[PDB]
Amino acid sequence: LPDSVDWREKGCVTEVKYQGSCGACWAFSAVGALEAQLKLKTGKLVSLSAQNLVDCSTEKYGNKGCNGGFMTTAFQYIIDNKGIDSDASYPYKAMDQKCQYDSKYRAATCSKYTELPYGREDVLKEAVANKGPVSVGVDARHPSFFLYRSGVYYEPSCTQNVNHGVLVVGYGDLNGKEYWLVKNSWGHNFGEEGYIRMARNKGNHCGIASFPSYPEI
Numbered sequence: 001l002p003d004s005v006d007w008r009e010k011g012c013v014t015e016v017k018y019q020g021s022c023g024a025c026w027a028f029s030a031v032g033a034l035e036a037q038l039k040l041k042t043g044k045l046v047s048l049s050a051q052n053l054v055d056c057s058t059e060k061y062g063n064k065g066c067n068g069g070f071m072t073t074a075f076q077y078i079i080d081n082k083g084i085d086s087d088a089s090y091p092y093k094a095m096d097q098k099c100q101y102d103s104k105y106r107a108a109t110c111s112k113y114t115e116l117p118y119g120r121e122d123v124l125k126e127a128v129a130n131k132g133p134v135s136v137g138v139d140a141r142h143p144s145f146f147l148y149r150s151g152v153y154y155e156p157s158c159t160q161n162v163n164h165g166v167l168v169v170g171y172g173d174l175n176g177k178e179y180w181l182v183k184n185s186w187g188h189n190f191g192e193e194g195y196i197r198m199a200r201n202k203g204n205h206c207g208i209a210s211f212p213s214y215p216e217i
């Protein structure tokens with residue numbers, strides 16, 4: 001496997017989004033993963049509608065809109081729905097709204113999704129290198145997470161009790177510290193222009209490899 005990977009260099013990652021006061025991290029994680037696959041398949045980079053997931057992938061998928069959701073069930077909704085609209089056609093409002101999906105605005109489809117084995121960072125590395133960005137959950141509740149600015153994030157108080165859905169778009173090594181390149185959805189003001197490098201191969205730090213999954217088209 002390559003020593004390092006960064007899907008941004010392959011034009012497979014869209015601009016960092018700002019979820020605001022709506023707990024839609026799961027939706028942004030899911031669309032980010034599908035966006036890479038869409039780019040890989042069609043050659044076109046297109047932001048997908050996180051709002052579409054918030055408003056439509058709901059109760060039936062065990063999701064709660066602005067109150068939380070799952071990337072895997074969001075993927076299944078896209079499969080069941082036979083599509084997901086573009087962000088431009090169905091903009092993000094950081095609120096729970098009535099489902100307004102319209103296939104006339106469909107920008108991607110999903111045929112299946114895969115959940116990686118729990119806590120295996122080597123398997124996660126293989127997937128990020130060979131398949132594309134991977135949706136994951138991390139423990140982002142520690143004060144240090146919000147204040148991250150640079151370097152490689154390592155928090156002794158971190159746990160494998162994850163609460164925040166984000167996207168791994170790469171991995172590598174910085175000054176002797178291996179890391180996972182993570183795309184957050186708290187806008188460009190957070191961390192390194194919206195990204196955070198989180199410790200890799202450090203005992204599944206913050207649960208980053210606890211619940212990984214990626215869709216396919």
Ligand SMILES: CN1CCC(C#N)(NC(=O)[C@H](CC2CCCCC2)NC(=O)N2CCOCC2)CC1
Pocket residue numbers: 019022023024025026062063064066067068069070071136137162163164165211
């Ligand atoms: C509790 N609050 C809700 C929104 C948030 C995001 N944004 N997190 C979530 O949506 C997380 C993401 C999930 C990804 C997969 C591994 C486990 C975590 N989910 C989540 O909080 N719920 C609670 C409601 O029932 C559905 C799941 C931040 C924390």
